[PDB]
Amino acid sequence: TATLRPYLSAVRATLQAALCLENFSSQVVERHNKPEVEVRSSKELLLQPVTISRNEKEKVLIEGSINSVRVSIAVKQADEIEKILCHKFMRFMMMRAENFFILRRKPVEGYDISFLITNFHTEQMYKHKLVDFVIHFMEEIDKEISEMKLSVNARARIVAEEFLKNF
């Protein structure tokens, strides 16, 4: 229902306001330094979580803190075959969360993938290029899904001829 260009622009601006991190040594352990969004041990360091949504299926949650922000996405599963392709796409990507440095090794329940951005990343990597990555991820993922669907048809169509032809 909602078109792509207005929806993406809204997510960009919100995420630009949330990416305002600073370093913060924790209050509740002697000198540990940890992302407040994950440990949630303090509860005045947390920002109000906000959702942007294109329709009832596609939405983004932006959830910030003085030193960290978490972004979690859900994508339109347009048919049964696409659920399986999508889930496995995430797993093989998420399996390299040590190279996608902003990526959590697990999604949030009810979300398909989720990024944890700490102050160290926004100090060590160009902020506007991380946001461009998150936007680019949404610009492509349903093209990248559909391309596998076209190829999975082709594989089966070859396998059928390879069996039937030898009769």
Binding site: S151, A154, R155, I158, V159, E162
Partner: protein, 411 residues
């Protein structure tokens, strides 16, 4: 169940396949896969990525050692699986072609090299449960199986259940102590010297001296002389003097066949014979940064074990894996340990004025015919038991937890 479980042991040199309960592995094959190749059609636009059904044109094992038109790959290195795409293609053809097993109806026992990271135990479990829908898997410690192979083979009067096993396969050598059926995980040591680096050392040592070896076959001949002519010597510099003075006869000849021209070629075989096996005793010959002789690494293990089990461990050292087959390899390690242990007791004599003489430790190093497949044969005698079917993870457990059911390891 009625159908037997599969036992699939994968090493960095060889893999060993068969159903449980057999006395002996039903396939021994090299751990190699020969994938299809192209004239730079794979390039910066896309590397080694296939389309349609082009990915299924490949072979594994000896069916892949000698095919001309394919690029040979070796997925397992230092025992660890390095490229899971090739390993999964390897596993499929093991099951659906070599074993003829239906994965959905046979339990699998599959082997952990004691160094491997937990992520690799997740990924190997993801294969069997989520790719193949195996009904249940178990990941076995290779060294404990090797001990069980000795245990069932050796005489019932000395089935001690206690010993240190040295498992110098290819990849890395493990030295592991087991006391009365429990792995003492704290004391396990890894030595990087293994059959590959002994091969590589001999390969370089030839290629500097004996050019004429064709580049396609340097590795084959290096392996041959390692297997056929090499031995652990009595004293390093005393051999060099013997090889100089009796160079008419300690020097040997190997004849190879040119794979391309089918002309023969000959090489003189010499200092290669005792260098190599002595890399276990002088690891700095092959690695910049390991130096303790194997005969002094094994001592540190026992000396870290609980005080009561120390003497029994010396009484029963078991040799496992192919590289331990070298001539005199047992004799020398026993001599070095014996010379170390009784000298250690000579100190505690003097700190007590010779007032009491300690009962000297006897040391034994034991060679047995299973050495080429003791890991699988142990695996078969385990996976036969009705107990084994309850130690395995049932498939539902992979559903309720994640693949994390294989995070744990006994180290």
């Amino acid at each position: 169940g009625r159908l037997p479980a599969c036992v699939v042991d994968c090493g960095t040199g060889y893999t060993k396949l068969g159903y449980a309960g057999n006395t002996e592995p039903q396939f021994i094959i090299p751990s190699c896969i020969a994938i299809k190749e192209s004239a730079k059609v794979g390039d910066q636009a896309q590397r080694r990525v296939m389309k349609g059904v082009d990915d299924l044109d490949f072979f594994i094992g000896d069916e892949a050692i000698e095919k001309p038109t394919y690029a040979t790959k070796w997925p397992i290195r230092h025992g660890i699986v390095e490229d899971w795409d090739l390993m999964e293609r390897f596993m499929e053809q093991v099951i659906f072609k070599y074993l003829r097993a239906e994965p959905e109806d046979h339990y699998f026992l599959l082997t952990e090299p004691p160094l491997n990271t937990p992520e690799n135990r997740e990924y190997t479990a993801e294969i069997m449960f989520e790719s193949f829908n195996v009904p249940g898997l178990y990941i076995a410690v290779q060294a404990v199986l090797a001990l069980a192979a000795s245990w069932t083979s050796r005489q019932v009067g000395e089935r001690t259940l206690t010993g240190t096993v040295i498992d110098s396969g290819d990849g890395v050598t493990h030295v592991i102590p087991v006391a009365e059926g429990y792995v003492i995980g704290s004391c396990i040591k890894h030595i990087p010297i293994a059959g590959r680096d002994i091969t590589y050392f001999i390969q370089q040592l030839l290629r500097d001296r004996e050019v004429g070896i064709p580049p396609e076959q340097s590795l084959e001949t290096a392996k041959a002389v390692k297997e056929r002519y090499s031995y652990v010597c009595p004293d390093l510099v005393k051999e060099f003097n013997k090889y100089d003075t009796d160079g008419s006869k300690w020097i040997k000849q190997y004849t190879g066949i040119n794979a391309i021209s089918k002309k023969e070629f000959s090489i003189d075989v010499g200092y290669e014979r005792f260098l190599g096996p002595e890399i276990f005793f002088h690891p700095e010959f092959a690695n910049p940064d390991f130096t303790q002789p194997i005969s002094e690494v094994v001592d540190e293990v026992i000396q870290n074990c609980p005080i009561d089990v120390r003497r029994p461990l010396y009484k029963n050292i078991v040799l496992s894996g192919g590289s331990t087959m070298f001539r005199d390899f047992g004799r020398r390690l026993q001599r070095d340990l014996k010379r170390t242990v009784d000298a250690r007791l000579k100190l505690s004599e003097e700190l007590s004025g010779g007032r009491l003489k300690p009962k000297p430790i006897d040391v034994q190093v034991i060679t047995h015919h299973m050495q080429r497949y003791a890991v699988w044969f142990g695996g078969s005698m385990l996976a036969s038991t009705p107990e084994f079917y309850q130690v395995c993870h049932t498939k539902k457990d992979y559903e309720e937890i994640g693949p994390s059911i294989c995070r744990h390891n006994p180290v």
